[PDB]
């Protein structure tokens, strides 16, 4: 697998037309504040096709 190529699987809101966003903050998937650490309902928003 080649992991140089990434896609965002989670975001707070849909993009506006031609909106670009390189941010890498932890996505909060539920009730609990994630404070920049991975865990239950606290996910890295990028993935790779590999």
């Amino acid at each position: 697998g080649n992991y140089n190529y990434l896609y965002r699987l989670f975001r707070k809101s849909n993009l506006k037309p031609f909106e670009r966003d390189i941010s890498t903050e932890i996505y909060q998937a539920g009730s609990t504040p994630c404070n920049g650490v991975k865990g239950f309902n606290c996910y890295f928003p990028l993935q790779s096709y590999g």
């Binding site: 506006k16 031609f18 670009r20 966003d21 390189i22």
Partner: protein, 108 residues
């Protein structure tokens, strides 16, 4: 007044746009910046571009990831506020900046 900053968080974990006016030059730049808590003019880089008696007027608007600037200059008499009269601003630039915007600040 010699510049502006625009963005969502304005600094840190998100992108933001900087403009600076520099005697004869103009500079425009976009990055995940970390500017001062109280910015100043006087004595990353995911987009970049380079080039009382008066009133300078401007409009800034963001549409479809482009950022549009219009402007006008005029002489004035009125000391208190914006003078009653009429002129229309004309387009300067239409920049493909792509970022989201929510907040701004003046540089002076």
């Amino acid at each position: 007044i010699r510049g502006w900053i625009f963005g969502t968080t304005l600094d840190s974990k998100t992108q933001s746009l900087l403009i600076v006016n520099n005697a004869t030059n103009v500079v425009i730049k976009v990055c995940e910046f970390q500017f001062c808590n109280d910015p100043f003019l006087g004595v990353n880089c995911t987009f970049e571009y380079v080039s009382f008696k008066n009133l300078r007027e401007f409009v800034f608007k963001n549409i479809d990831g482009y950022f549009k600037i219009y402007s006008k200059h005029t002489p004035i008499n009125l000391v208190r506020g914006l003078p009653q009269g009429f002129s229309a601003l004309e387009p300067l630039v239409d920049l493909p900046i792509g970022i989201n915007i929510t907040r701004f600040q003046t540089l002076l």
